[PDB]
């Protein structure tokens, strides 16, 4: 619970998530863009207006918030094994001579 470091009383507007995308992300895909999402057919020319929205939205993290809305840093370690020789092995402690 990274409450102390990432919480701004004003809010830390620098942490954000994507509210709307046309399709579910493919596994391990990375997607970074600012493109307007519409509901109507109008192109809308990239303005904040009916059927025009900015897709990223902030988490508004703020200290006086409950456990549910508090920063939680996540580290997803994965293990990749290929036909090439392995190079990341494990301390392998020993015995005295």
């Amino acid at each position: 619970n990274s409450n102390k470091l990432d919480s701004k009383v004003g809010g830390n507007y620098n942490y954000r998530y994507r509210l709307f995308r046309k399709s579910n992300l493919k596994p391990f895909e990375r997607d970074i863009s600012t493109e307007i999402y519409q509901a109507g057919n109008k192109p809308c020319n990239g303005v904040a207006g009916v059927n025009c929205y900015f897709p990223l939205q902030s988490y508004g993290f703020r200290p006086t918030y409950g456990v549910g809305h508090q920063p939680y840093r996540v580290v997803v370690l994965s293990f990749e094994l290929l036909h090439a020789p392995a190079t990341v092995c494990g301390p392998k402690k020993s015995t005295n001579l």
């Epitope: 509210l19 046309k22 579910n24 519409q38 509901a39 929205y53 918030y65 409950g66 549910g68 809305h69």
Partner: antibody
Amino acid sequence: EVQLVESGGDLVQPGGSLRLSCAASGFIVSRNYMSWVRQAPGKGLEWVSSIYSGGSTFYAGSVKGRFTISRDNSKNTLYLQMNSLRAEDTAIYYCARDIPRHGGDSWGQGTLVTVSS
Amino acid sequence: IRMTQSPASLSASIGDRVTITCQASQDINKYLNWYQQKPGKAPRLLIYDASNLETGVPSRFSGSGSGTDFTFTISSLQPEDIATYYCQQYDNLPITFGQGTRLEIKR
């Protein structure tokens, strides 16, 4: 105008299968969040199902596996296939588009389902 | 969430100041919408997020809250204000509405 004629259903025996249809004026069904509320006569509105902008489906506890939701790109017409019905499902069903955080809404007039014997 | 609305029969004369209180069982932060359902006609969305009244509404309805307890206010009770108002939370997957507060007018 976001006006909805979500008009399908009138009634069946217990154990039947009805098919609702919703409809759409300014937007496309498959691009915006939509859901289906359920208002029993004289009772607080209860939430049955909800679709997302990428096909994610979420249901309610009482409708796990009897109800289905389905989205139709060709003619709008957000479809909700009611199956495995019973004698306590009688309620008014309203089609609903919810834009999640920026705030607008469509709740269409809604249709009556009285399913009985 | 066990949504709780405390006033169900509340009756004020023409042009009065009333208040509706919707209460929850956890922290829903600010994601609680206020609806207005006239008899027969489909519900309208009045205050999304608990702090933002939708444009085009008359400008009397105001709401403010955070975390569990929320409140809804009516600034000028025009005669054409008879309806039933609902509070909805839209970010916890078991979306549960509230009971409604049937408002009436006295003369």
